[PDB]
Amino acid sequence: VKIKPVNNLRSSSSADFVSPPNSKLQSLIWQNPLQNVYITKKPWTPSTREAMVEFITHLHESYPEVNVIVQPDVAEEISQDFKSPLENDPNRPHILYTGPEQDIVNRTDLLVTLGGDGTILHGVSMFGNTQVPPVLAFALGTLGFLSPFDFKEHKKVFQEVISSRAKCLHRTRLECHLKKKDSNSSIVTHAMNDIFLHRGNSPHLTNLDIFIDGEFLTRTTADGVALATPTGSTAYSLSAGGSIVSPLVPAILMTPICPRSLSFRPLILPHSSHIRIKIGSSVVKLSVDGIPQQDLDVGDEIYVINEVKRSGIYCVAKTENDWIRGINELLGFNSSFRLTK
Amino acid sequence: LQSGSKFVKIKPVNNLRSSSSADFVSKLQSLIWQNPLQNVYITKKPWTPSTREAMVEFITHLHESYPEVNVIVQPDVAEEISQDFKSPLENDPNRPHILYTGPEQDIVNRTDLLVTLGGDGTILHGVSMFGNTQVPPVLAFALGTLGFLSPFDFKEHKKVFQEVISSRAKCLHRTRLECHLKKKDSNSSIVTHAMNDIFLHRGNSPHLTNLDIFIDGEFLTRTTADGVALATPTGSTAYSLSAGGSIVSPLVPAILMTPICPRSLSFRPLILPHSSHIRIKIGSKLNQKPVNSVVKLSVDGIPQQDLDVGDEIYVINEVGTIYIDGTKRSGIYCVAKTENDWIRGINELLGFNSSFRLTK
Amino acid sequence: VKIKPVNNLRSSSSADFVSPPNSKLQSLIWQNPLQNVYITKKPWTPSTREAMVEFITHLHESYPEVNVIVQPDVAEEISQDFKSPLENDPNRPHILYTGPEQDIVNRTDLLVTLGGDGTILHGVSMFGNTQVPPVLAFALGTLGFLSPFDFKEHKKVFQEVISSRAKCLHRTRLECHLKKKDSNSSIVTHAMNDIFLHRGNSPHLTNLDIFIDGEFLTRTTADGVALATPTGSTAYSLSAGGSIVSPLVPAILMTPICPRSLSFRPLILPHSSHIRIKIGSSVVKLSVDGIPQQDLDVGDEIYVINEVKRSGIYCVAKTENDWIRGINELLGFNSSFRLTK
Amino acid sequence: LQSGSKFVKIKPVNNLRSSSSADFVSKLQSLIWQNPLQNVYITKKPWTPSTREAMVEFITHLHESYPEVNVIVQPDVAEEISQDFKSPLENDPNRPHILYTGPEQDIVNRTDLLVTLGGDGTILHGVSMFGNTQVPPVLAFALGTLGFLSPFDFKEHKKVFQEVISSRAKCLHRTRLECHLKKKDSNSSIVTHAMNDIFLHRGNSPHLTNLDIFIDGEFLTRTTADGVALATPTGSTAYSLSAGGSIVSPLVPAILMTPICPRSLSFRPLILPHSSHIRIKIGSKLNQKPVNSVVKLSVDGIPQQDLDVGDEIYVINEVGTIYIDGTKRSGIYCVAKTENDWIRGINELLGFNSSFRLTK
Numbered sequence A, C: 001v002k003i004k005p006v007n008n009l010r011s012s013s014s015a016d017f018v019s020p021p022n023s024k025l026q027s028l029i030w031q032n033p034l035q036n037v038y039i040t041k042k043p044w045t046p047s048t049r050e051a052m053v054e055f056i057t058h059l060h061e062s063y064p065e066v067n068v069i070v071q072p073d074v075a076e077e078i079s080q081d082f083k084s085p086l087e088n089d090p091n092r093p094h095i096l097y098t099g100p101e102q103d104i105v106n107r108t109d110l111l112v113t114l115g116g117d118g119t120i121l122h123g124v125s126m127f128g129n130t131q132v133p134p135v136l137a138f139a140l141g142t143l144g145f146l147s148p149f150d151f152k153e154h155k156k157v158f159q160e161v162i163s164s165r166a167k168c169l170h171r172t173r174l175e176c177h178l179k180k181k182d183s184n185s186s187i188v189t190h191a192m193n194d195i196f197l198h199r200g201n202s203p204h205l206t207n208l209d210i211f212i213d214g215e216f217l218t219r220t221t222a223d224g225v226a227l228a229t230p231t232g233s234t235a236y237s238l239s240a241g242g243s244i245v246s247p248l249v250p251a252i253l254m255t256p257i258c259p260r261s262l263s264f265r266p267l268i269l270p271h272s273s274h275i276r277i278k279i280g281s282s283v284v285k286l287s288v289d290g291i292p293q294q295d296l297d298v299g300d301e302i303y304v305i306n307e308v309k310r311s312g313i314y315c316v317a318k319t320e321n322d323w324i325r326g327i328n329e330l331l332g333f334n335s336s337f338r339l340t341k
Numbered sequence B, D: 001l002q003s004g005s006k007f008v009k010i011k012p013v014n015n016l017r018s019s020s021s022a023d024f025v026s027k028l029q030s031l032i033w034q035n036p037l038q039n040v041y042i043t044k045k046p047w048t049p050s051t052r053e054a055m056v057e058f059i060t061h062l063h064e065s066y067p068e069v070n071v072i073v074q075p076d077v078a079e080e081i082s083q084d085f086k087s088p089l090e091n092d093p094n095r096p097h098i099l100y101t102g103p104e105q106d107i108v109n110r111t112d113l114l115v116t117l118g119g120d121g122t123i124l125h126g127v128s129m130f131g132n133t134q135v136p137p138v139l140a141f142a143l144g145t146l147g148f149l150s151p152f153d154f155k156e157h158k159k160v161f162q163e164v165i166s167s168r169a170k171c172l173h174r175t176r177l178e179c180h181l182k183k184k185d186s187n188s189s190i191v192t193h194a195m196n197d198i199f200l201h202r203g204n205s206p207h208l209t210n211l212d213i214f215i216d217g218e219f220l221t222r223t224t225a226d227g228v229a230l231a232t233p234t235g236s237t238a239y240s241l242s243a244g245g246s247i248v249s250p251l252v253p254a255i256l257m258t259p260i261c262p263r264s265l266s267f268r269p270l271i272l273p274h275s276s277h278i279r280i281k282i283g284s285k286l287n288q289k290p291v292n293s294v295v296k297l298s299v300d301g302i303p304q305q306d307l308d309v310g311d312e313i314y315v316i317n318e319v320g321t322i323y324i325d326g327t328k329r330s331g332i333y334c335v336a337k338t339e340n341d342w343i344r345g346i347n348e349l350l351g352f353n354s355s356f357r358l359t360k
């Protein structure tokens, strides 16, 4: 194993996305060859560690041109896990490119995740405002919803990816603009799942004034409220009683979290909606994709829109019908009562 | 057809010129008449005095104020209301009120504007006439018991019609669904068009429907239930709402799939892409009740047919369906009152998120 | 096989029910020996037919004192199914007692069901206003919710029953009093599950005025409304969004069926409630335990109370915790999302 | 304790006689005083002018009209309101307003009647004082922002108190739950009493709670969620309602089990027998986040403790629990306004089954 600085590699090369006739998905076409592959994994998890080693071994064996990128602390963790050099000659060790977060962000052509939903969410968030490279997600360890591929098929799947034969689902994201009373500027954060406000530690209910496109919608006194992407419709929003929304639908979900109301039916809003929520009368917690942000005081506001740089997240898909299969087999959608045995 | 007054003449609607499709310049679309507005088709909720009175009053206004305007009504309505006009135009007995009428196909071809006098059902049946063709703009006045869709009080009719004819009105676009019924032992299809919804229901039968649902050629689920509803966003506030569905803005491109009293704890309502291809086949359980008339099919509330085990419906949006391997202006334009009709409608008419009593 | 008239048998002997300390159930104590056993089965169903033969064979073999009662058309159907007489001597054929419905009702000590929920419901309804004998329910064919026993354990279970060692769950029933505008008197019907009003064949919504103990509750415009026992809480009421209510709770459920309202949350009402529902402005169908009754016109009324003759239905229970097990294993209660494989 | 006026004397509540438990002759129970009503404990919503004003006005009325009556308030309240009395009794400077006060245990032993001035929280905290003992009858006046439980406007206080003291009032019985907290590595229990509910919640933690639920010693389910609520019928209109629970009449003997934002499509709310034995153990998933402070426990909204993996709560009704093998007047009596407070409350305060707008 040899650790090298990632700053030796060229900046990210963009892929092209085309919508073929009678497809729900976008063809992933590498206009310049794929080279910079960043691999992230669920930490402190044996199966993701072993799968990473095995995936990198496979890449170094089968794809000389591919440069493997990992985090610094990860490169240290897995260096001892490789023993046999390439084709068993001591002159080709396993080259791991690594460096500061920004260097990785600037150079990544393809993001590969080994783990669950958290792994994808945190990998994608690392990119901040840089357009996100395509995401190839393998499910390892405890199951989540978003990763379509079993690690066992990693060789066949990656071959389709690098050969411009794979297709991607486009997942839209929300932008959260936080405006606190005190200071000058907005803090902007991107959400794959959701942005939510919650009483959290406080025993007192939130009082939220909700505006759509400048028009007052409603006051809600509640545990909180969730604004979700269609991707996020299966996450917190689903727990709170929301509908399941195919990731192909352009929309924003507004789902109340335990409201003092008999009639706050969940809303499905247009993609282009501008949502403003004002904290009315440390009272309220703000979270983006589950990660706590600043605490909000009475008078603070969030402004939420769809992300409009190529926007959104392109995730390699297994089939044209991944969503159907996921809701059935992962979420237990419309499970039949037992009719025999 | 016999008029019940010498002050009314009933004339063939084929005496009128073909429809002038308007322009829609653009979240609301401006309604701008390329050819001037002339042929106004008026429908009303039947057997309700207020709407018959409103129709006569509206037609009187058009005949008084807009000489270029031609009034079209249904044949039975023409006969019904003919005795209600108690004077000719401008006190001149040689200028009777003229009402144009004829068969649907004749009316459909010549309508520039649909005006409805009644409730939600009035709009639904009116638009339903224009199923296989282009729907003219829809001007909807609420009379009698309130519904959700008609944005105007009939009291406002002079000022609203004024704005419409002068090309100063704006419209909300509402999408339409297509239901294709394919009977067991048939390769033909019966096509219907939906503004609200398409639904299957056990109806008169005491036994639950058993329905196999396929999306984009893939099997989704079997449901055993009262039935299932497929709804436009417009229809999200209708049957689908009653069945526990989400409220969907009419600007969202989606199809709702909402179960009706399912034997399941986990049939959460689904929101599907507007591009979806939906097939529902009427099934049964092994050795059973009757296999005929086990399910009723309705489209915008209108019973179509009882269906048998083996029948299928195919449901798609009017435009933009994606057919994955293994499977004329569109939509409806409704004259809007404000740029915020939707939020105000859900709040004031449906009581969306009504606060618990906080004072007094 | 020999067919005999059931009118040769004594009238029904009642069992005694005692609530032992630290039990949820009622001990079934035969004060006079159990003798008259009426067996009913889901019709046109091979497995129930074969199980009936096998159960009767077992009774004639092991319990000389037991008299087997079946329906006339059933006695004809199964007579050919027996071939071997008792202990293979031609002088003891299989004695089947049968006769008119009322004779069976008057003489039954124990009702045995072989089938599903429908079998129990229709067997129990046969008794009209006569107090219902204890019910021993075996699940055969397609699964339903109410029968706690697998037919395979029929010998062990019946031995506990006849030996006064079994325990019963007491299920309460509702009484429906139908008062049509036209005529003089009420038609009274008993419900194990529910009484419901529904638009049925009509495309027009029902308009129902609901009164509790003489006080106006609400007008509902809807597909309909269901009034359910706790037993019925897992039936139609559950499909309509009702809560799952243990059969030990004294209560009446009022669950709207697709109401034109955002705020008709299902209600749980006191056991002693008097519920009156008036049909407001062939418009409305009435069903009791799923069986269509008379059609109702505007101005007709139903009056619904708990049945107050020993009241209710005593069903032989398998364990103290049948309800937990049924909701988990039959209804898929709180099914976990897939966490592995 | 220092009074802020020579017109008020603050006296030890132990100067008063032990409580007189009333009689409850019998769906409402008549409140008939065996010993005459004397010791009136008054609580108010803190830091709200209307309730401080109401307290002074109520106490003034008692002192003017009922010489036999003794007023008990909290120690800090006695000091707070002492400066608010601007005259002595009957203009006699030798007859100051007397306010009795002391520690909870002292107050609890001597209260004939609890009077609350505020909202739902005021009742909850007031009743909470009488946890391990008998709860005196509760007379609840609504001041400030409306809640659900207080049936009387404070304006009505003279006429209502008149009915109560003269043994002409009626009360609704509300049952209480007991929460037994058994810490990990402990065999002792911390007991609390609930009028509304007992709930577990992730609170400050960003991770979901993992809770193992046992009923009557049998494992029911593991839930991964924000949390779970166990509620009385009284509490069915509180947190449980917000979480999607059914509205349960306070005359039904039951315990509600309602999930709070569960990771499941099938955790339908449960209604359990009042006799039920409920145990909930704080679990975790294999190799995880922190194991401490993973869940908050609240009882009637009051945070008790952060709980750790391995802690358990046991929840039972105050009376009538059945313990299947392997596992003083009770309840709360609230003075009622009419024989139909419940139907009127759900309709008028909660907007139960609010009709869509049908006219105007």
Ligand SMILES: NC(=O)C1=CN([C@@H]2O[C@H](COP(=O)(O)OP(=O)(O)OC[C@H]3O[C@@H](n4cnc5c(N)ncnc54)[C@H](O)[C@@H]3O)[C@@H](O)[C@H]2O)C=CC1
Pocket: A116, A117, A118, A119, A121, A143, A144, A145, A146, A193, A194, A231, A232, A233, A234, A235, A236, A237, A239, A240, A288, A289, A290, A291, D206, D207, D208, D225, D226, D260, D261, D262, D263
């Ligand atoms: N359901 C609930 O009561 C709560 C849910 N959350 C969700 O956790 C999400 C963060 O995910 P993690 O980083 O894994 O944190 P995590 O491990 O704390 O919780 C996430 C749980 O939700 C699942 N999940 C996440 N995204 C999903 C999606 N799009 N569809 C279906 N299931 C999904 C995960 O697989 C995991 O089971 C937040 O975006 C929020 O939606 C956060 C708080 C409460």
Ligand SMILES: NC(=O)C1=CN([C@@H]2O[C@H](COP(=O)(O)OP(=O)(O)OC[C@H]3O[C@@H](n4cnc5c(N)ncnc54)[C@H](O)[C@@H]3O)[C@@H](O)[C@H]2O)C=CC1
Pocket: B119, B120, B121, B122, B124, B146, B147, B148, B149, B196, B197, B234, B235, B236, B237, B238, B239, B240, B242, B243, B299, B300, B301, B302, C203, C204, C205, C222, C223, C258, C259, C260
């Ligand atoms: N909620 C329920 O239980 C049922 C509802 N329906 C609805 O009736 C519709 C047909 O309408 P009508 O001819 O007036 O028959 P209708 O008068 O029998 O039913 C219409 C009821 O639903 C309301 N409605 C209809 N469309 C609506 C919409 N888009 N948003 C909000 N409310 C709406 C109407 O105002 C009226 O109160 C069908 O498309 C179906 O959606 C049909 C059967 C049952």
Ligand SMILES: NC(=O)C1=CN([C@@H]2O[C@H](COP(=O)(O)OP(=O)(O)OC[C@H]3O[C@@H](n4cnc5c(N)ncnc54)[C@H](O)[C@@H]3O)[C@@H](O)[C@H]2O)C=CC1
Pocket: B206, B207, B208, B225, B226, B260, B261, B262, B263, C116, C117, C118, C119, C121, C143, C144, C145, C146, C193, C194, C231, C232, C233, C234, C235, C236, C237, C239, C240, C288, C289, C290, C291
């Ligand atoms: N869920 C729905 O949409 C509808 C349900 N029903 C139910 O059918 C019941 C009559 O039962 P059957 O004679 O078997 O007719 P059935 O065969 O037509 O339908 C009954 C279905 O409900 C199940 N079921 C019946 N009682 C149940 C209970 N107490 N708990 C859980 N599941 C139960 C049966 O096993 C069967 O799956 C009626 O009392 C009514 O509750 C009737 C119409 C519609």
Ligand SMILES: NC(=O)C1=CN([C@@H]2O[C@H](COP(=O)(O)OP(=O)(O)OC[C@H]3O[C@@H](n4cnc5c(N)ncnc54)[C@H](O)[C@@H]3O)[C@@H](O)[C@H]2O)C=CC1
Pocket: A203, A204, A205, A222, A223, A258, A259, A260, D119, D120, D121, D122, D124, D146, D147, D148, D149, D196, D197, D234, D235, D236, D237, D238, D239, D240, D242, D243, D299, D300, D301, D302
């Ligand atoms: N709905 C929600 O999202 C939450 C509700 N709560 C409720 O707060 C209760 C504590 O009450 P407070 O001390 O006033 O704190 P609070 O003022 O923070 O919450 C009480 C809110 O719930 C209402 N409420 C309380 N009990 C009720 C009941 N039995 N029926 C109808 N409404 C009721 C109150 O009027 C008030 O609007 C707890 O027992 C819990 O049930 C606590 C947290 C969240």
